[PDB]
């Protein structure tokens, strides 16, 4: 009963992408049982970023709407919370790795993110900043070795109508022993709703719902 119908969060990220260091702070809010949230981020160090915002945007699992019959691993993990680690392999060789800790403090989610991005080609759409947001995704979740894993083949939209693809694996682990669901899918749609000219301030909006795999 600790995850309320309406919850806020605070986040801090530090990252290095192609050698460029930076820090981001943000806050957000949403409805964890209805499966939606918004966030407002600001680049507090090392901005403007010389690369697409979209590689950062998918870097808040407590807010996925779960059917009654699929255990909500993310919510059951609280108040302790959970960690996750992720690799995102972009098709042109760019790699993003991420570690993250989510906890609950004073009735607010606290997220802490560290990430590194390497090998984004100088001429590619990330460094060229030619992406236009992610298409909707289906994250395949499944229990493996006392943790919960998610795989996603994700696609960033390109200006010219093409797509730029990243193969994503994430391991989710509760900080306390918690019951695992069976395999299932989280449908997710994230959009950037507004930003200043140089993406030093960005607002984004995500909806996510668990569902069975037929």
Numbering used by the authors: 6 to 64, 69 to 223
The study reports:
Recently, three OFPs with novel phenotypes have been developed: permanently fluorescent LSSmOrange with a large Stokes shift (437 nm, 572 nm) and two proteins photoswitchable from orange to far-red fluorescent states PSmOrange ( 548 nm, 565 nm; photoconverted form 636 nm, 662 nm) and PSmOrange2 ( 546 nm, 561 nm; photoconverted form 619 nm, 651 nm). LSSmOrange and PSmOrange have been engineered from mOrange and PSmOrange2 has been engineered from PSmOrange using directed molecular evolution. Electron density maps show that LSSmOrange, PSmOrange, and PSmOrange2 have the same chromophore structures as parental mOrange. It consists of p-hydroxyphenyl, imidazolinone, and 2-hydroxy-dihydrooxazole rings.
PSmOrange could be used for multicolor photolabeling, super-resolution photoactivated localization microscopy (PALM), and tracking of the photoswitched cell population in living animals. In mOrange, Q64 forms H-bonds with guanidine group of R95 and the main chain carbonyl of I60. Substitution of Q64 with Leu disables formation of these two H-bonds. The side chain carboxyl of Y99 forms new water-mediated H-bond with the main chain carbonyl of I60. These two changes result in the protein that in the presence of oxidizing agents such as potassium ferricyanide or intracellular oxidants and light could be converted into a far-red emitting form. SDS-PAGE and mass spectrometry results demonstrated that PSmOrange photoconversion is accompanied by a cleavage of polypeptide chain between the chromophore and F65 and by oxidation of the hydroxyl of 2-hydroxy-dihydrooxazole ring of the chromophore to carbonyl. This modification strongly affects the conjugation system of the chromophore - it enables the chromophore to recover its distorted planarity around Cα1 atom and adds C = O bond to the conjugation resulting in a substantial (∼90 nm) bathochromic shift of photoconverted PSmOrange absorbance/emission bands.
